[PDB]
Amino acid sequence: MSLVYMNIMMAFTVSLTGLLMYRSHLMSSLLCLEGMMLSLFILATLMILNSHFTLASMMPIILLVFAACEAALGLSLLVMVSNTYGTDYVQNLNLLQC
Amino acid sequence: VAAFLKNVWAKEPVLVASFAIAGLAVILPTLSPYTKYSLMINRATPYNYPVPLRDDGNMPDVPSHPQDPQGPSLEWLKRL
Amino acid sequence: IMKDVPGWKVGESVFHTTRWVTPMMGELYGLRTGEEILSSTYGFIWYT
Amino acid sequence: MNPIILIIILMTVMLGTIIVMISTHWLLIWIGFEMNMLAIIPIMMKKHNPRATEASTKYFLTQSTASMLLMMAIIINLMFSGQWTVMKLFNPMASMLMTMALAMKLGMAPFHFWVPEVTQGIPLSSGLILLTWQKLAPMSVLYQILPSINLDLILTLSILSITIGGWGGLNQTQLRKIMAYSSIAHMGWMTAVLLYNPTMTLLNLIIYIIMTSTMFTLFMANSTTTTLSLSHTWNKAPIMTILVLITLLSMGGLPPLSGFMPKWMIIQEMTKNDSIILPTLMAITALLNLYFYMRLTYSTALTMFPSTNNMKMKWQFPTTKRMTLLPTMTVLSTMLLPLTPILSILE
Amino acid sequence: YPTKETAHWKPPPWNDVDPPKSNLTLNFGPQGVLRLVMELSG
Amino acid sequence: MMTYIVFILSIIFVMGFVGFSSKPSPIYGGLGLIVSGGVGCGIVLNFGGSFLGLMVFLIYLGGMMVVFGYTTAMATEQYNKVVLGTFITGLLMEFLMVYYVLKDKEVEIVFKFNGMGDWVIYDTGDSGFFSEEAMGIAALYSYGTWLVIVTGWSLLIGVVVIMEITRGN
Amino acid sequence: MMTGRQARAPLQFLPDEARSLPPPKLTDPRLAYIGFLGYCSGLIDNAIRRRPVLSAGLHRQFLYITSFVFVGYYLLKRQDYMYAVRDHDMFSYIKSHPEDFPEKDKKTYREVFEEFHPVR
Amino acid sequence: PFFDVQKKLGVDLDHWMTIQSAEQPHRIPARCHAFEKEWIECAHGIGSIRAEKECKIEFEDFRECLLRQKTMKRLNAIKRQRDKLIKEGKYTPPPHHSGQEDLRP
Amino acid sequence: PGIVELPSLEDLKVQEVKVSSSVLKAAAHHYGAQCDKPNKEFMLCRWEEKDPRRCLEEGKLVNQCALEFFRQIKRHCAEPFTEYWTCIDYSGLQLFRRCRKEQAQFDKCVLDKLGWVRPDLGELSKVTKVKTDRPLPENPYHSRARPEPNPEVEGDLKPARHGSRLFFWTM
Amino acid sequence: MNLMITLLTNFTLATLLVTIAFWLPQLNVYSEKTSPDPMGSARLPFSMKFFLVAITFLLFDLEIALLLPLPWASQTTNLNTMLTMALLLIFLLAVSLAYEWTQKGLEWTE
Ligand SMILES: CCCCCCCCCCCCCCCCCC(=O)OC[C@H](COP(=O)([O-])OC[C@H](O)COP(=O)([O-])OC[C@H](COC(=O)CCCCCCCCCCCCCCCCC)OC(=O)CCCCCCCCCCCCCCCCC)OC(=O)CCCCCCCCCCCCCCCCC
Ligand SMILES: CCCCCCCCCCCCCCCCCC(=O)OC[C@H](COP(=O)(O)OCCN)OC(=O)CCCCCCCCCCCCCCCCC
């Protein structure tokens, strides 16, 4: 298939493996999650514009909006973590081992 | 129903204007005689090609030419 | 061009159907120059 | 929380799951999962302590990752099929990504690592919602895509879930982690019979929801979150020890109880398809689940652990908690096996 | 079953509430002329 | 070379993701995701998605990454080898992908990909006096009633959810 | 399994052809067992709230019995319907495909040789 | 559980965006409208198990419309052979493929 | 699969309408009025055959009837038409509303010297009927035969023989 | 294409002026300066209210993104449904603003 889809899928996998390998910050995790969403937006958009499927042109906007609301919720969770420990470090979130 | 209205117009005229304009926007298109013409103008706008019909022999309402009498007209739009 | 190639049907449809298929951009402008390609494939998008 | 806001948020959780159940477009499937997650996050942060925020953060990260993999599976389906019907998928890569995403949502092993944490971090009512209501929407999507699910993947996820949920509960004393590893084992049992007979998948889901709702309702009615506080129940309410006894013996699947009903039916559908090793090893692995159920029954019903003196004060007060549907759920989770051919209503 | 790895684990609190583990001070200096020390809370 | 321009943007797009997926700091990672959003917007714009690309600017970049950078600047108090090694690893894997799919005009990582410029897959007609993508987004109010209801309800509930969980009571 | 059958007429608990079936009797032993489950739910509801088990709230016990018999009657109707649909589809498929279901020639034991295994 | 509320109540919540061949605004066809209509009219009602093996030709034509893999493979082959013959000097392109022909209309 | 069947380059030769888009747009209403019949025969054939190769000759008739349209402008009213399409041609959107007096002179000159009446608002967007002699295509999509459906349900619904037959349950 | 040329020209002129503004007075040899804020060294205290107004911006910006195709959506032939859904989206943005009001979310940055 087309050549641009290779790069958009590879971008989704790069943002996947960034989201699946945390370093320290939860904000960097949320950025990798939104990179995954952005690559999904681009890939859906290039397909729907290519196929001239008219009714799905409203589809990526929807894919934006919900997920950005999702991002808002994630930011709020991070802030609550930051209001407990002072930092958004993922190693502070280890109390549920016992 | 009248003292409360003068009270909220004395205290909060921004919000009274807000709810009043919103109420007009809700109820007024159902009371307008020209809401029908919005629909009629949006369906009178020819974005697509008028794909003609095969003349089977019995279609008295479909014209053979644009300048024929039968067919949909737009006298109402030119006159209003 | 495709004379030396073994097992090549010239003008072979890639579709099983015999219905007319709308010609793709690379089908039409594949053998032409890059200026004609760009003017036909990004001309309206890049027009100002 | 404002009770009106609690009602609207629980109706939004239910609305998300129902939108997953009734929709014919994959975008509305993804929207129902997003609405479900977005609305269930305040249910987990109901008490506002750092364990609830940690649990909600872990839950958000796992469900968000699964939602992104779900949308990538949907988008690859749109690549290779040009449409959006919620039916079989038209690419094994999209099928693998959707099966992984739904395994992450269900918390099936090896994507199980959030389930005993999050259930520990949240109250008993929100843990009840997470272990009963949050299974319904991904099992519906797995119900509708089973002509495309890889057999080796779904059975690998099933046996890995059953074994890890068996061994995980043996080391626990916290009741919520026990119910979470019980969840992982039972989801393994549900997905092991999915490609053979999905009516038995629905049967196992319904009997599991009934038994889990009974055990969480007993834990809420007795206000016990640990084994050793559940062992004070005989000196406070002796009927509740009988109820946790019969319900834990049901959840292990001992006949003549109704929790013997699903797994037996699952074996009844896996030997028709010439699989003998797999349901036998599954049934032998479920003895671990029954072992830590027996540990809880020895702590609670069949012995009497020592109590404290202040228990004598609680003798003067009856339970004012609304024990909603607890006799109904207790009867249904124990005495339903003579009505086993009722399962045809799920066909 | 406590092992060497899981030996530092204590049981969780009974109400499942962990203990919570300030306000800003500003020096609006001499840069009439007045020095101000603010304790702000937002 | 200019016939490959969207492909070229996509390469930069992948490079931008190796910017923030390697996670240098959430603020440089925010900057890398902003640059990635701009070049992915350019990819969208060069197929004819004008409105969707301006949604990438106005709503993803100007709407959401503003809030990411805003929240991030209220943390991570102002003043690696794993980041640099991860960045050069992702860059070398991407340039090996470029080298293979340009030397062969075909590659297969998971799916088979052509190596021609992505102009070849387009349509050779006109859409008349409308953008088809604009009319498909305009159909959200005429054909997308259930989609509008569930999206607006999810946004209202999202307002309620953020106000419940950020209160602590 | 039968999900394509109940897909042209969806979300119907009891279809119209279910009215061709004999309904379960009111003295159905399955229905009497469901009424016994209602009585057990009434006794457990008195026990968990520390009421006298057999005496307290006879109206509540009778509503438990009535509700379980009421739900279980329709559940038994749908059960009998789904097994009727199962057998109808089976017999129609055996009738429409004779080449997959031939009549096996049944041989009497005068021809049928069985190997004798002596127990000694 | 696919509780088909939309067919039960007769409402249309999401069937309209489901396929490319549905009713579109301003009657805009998809690029693979005809192939998808033929694949759907082939595979309608006969079930998925029969639809995989009996409607394979329409589905392969529709997938090759969607992703254009055989078409781009053929264009790869023709362009590669042309570039090889230009490198060997045994071929010259015509004036209408060099841009010297004063285009048609 | 098969070999695509393309018409030859001789089959595509026709005398083109080599005028610019402002010339065409300035003459558009009278062109739709006068050249109605071969245009609608062509477009009916084009939406019925769904194949341009099957629509060539009618298309040539379009390209034959447009020229006879413009020659009859060139023989009689070349100068008001020239002034009018020049005024149309100045505008970057080619507005009709900027050019009403040159339009009025061209319409006057055509109505006096050729009797052509400019169509009113609404007429050119009408759906007309077309009398043809070519046959209606019985299979324009070139589709093969559909698969036979599954056999339906028929007959009365009998009860299940000896009940559920689930291991020991007699009902 | 002309847009990309114009963006490159604007970005190049901006980068040139920034380079001149950062490097034209570096040529002078003025003096080395030793040089040894309202908060001294206290860490930045987090404001919940700035985060809430940014999230309220984000959610209302998503609702705006839904509202943006209305000048195109007014051209439809299903105008009763279009008007109903337009008024419903603006009404749900108003209900979001009202709930943000009544639970004191718009307070001390009102
Ligand atoms: C003119 C219009 C009006 C006409 C009126 C005509 C009738 C007048 C009399 C009215 C009363 C009728 C009552 C129902 C008819 C008789 C049903 C019957 O016996 O079925 C025989 C049934 C099969 O025997 P059969 O010789 O082949 O059939 C004789 C008839 O043709 C049976 O007919 P069938 O073959 O068509 O039966 C169908 C099928 C026949 O059954 C089968 O195909 C075999 C499968 C049965 C279930 C096996 C499940 C195995 C795993 C669970 C084991 C349960 C644990 C044991 C109990 C734990 C403690 C409660 O039944 C079922 O599948 C239903 C499930 C069993 C329920 C039977 C009715 C119970 C009502 C009262 C419940 C009270 C508690 C009873 C004990 C609870 C457990 C049953 O017997 C058994 O399975 C043995 C278990 C005991 C059955 C219940 C006995 C009912 C009477 C109990 C009175 C004393 C209660 C003491 C206090 C409570 C317990 C502590
Ligand atoms: C039905 C049409 C659609 C309606 C919805 C769409 C409206 C569009 C505008 C959006 C407004 C969004 C925000 C609304 C919030 C309302 C609640 C509120 O503000 O309550 C508090 C306020 C007192 O303010 P306070 O809390 O003290 O704040 C400091 C300022 N003094 O309390 C008040 O000021 C009281 C406010 C309520 C009374 C307003 C009455 C206006 C009446 C106008 C005529 C009727 C119009 C028809 C509609 C019915 C209105 C009831």
Ligand SMILES: CCCCCCCCCCCCCCCCCC(=O)OC[C@H](COP(=O)(O)OCCN)OC(=O)CCCCCCCCCCCCCCCCC
């Ligand atoms: C194919 C299947 C399709 C779908 C079919 C239907 C599936 C139903 C799945 C049921 C899932 C139930 C989820 C949990 C209940 C949701 C509402 C809730 O949160 O209730 C708990 C509530 C909270 O009150 P609160 O005050 O917070 O309690 C803590 C102490 N202060 O109140 C309490 O704590 C009160 C204590 C008792 C609560 C008992 C609730 C039991 C609900 C489940 C009943 C059994 C399932 C229904 C029957 C079988 C259906 C399959």
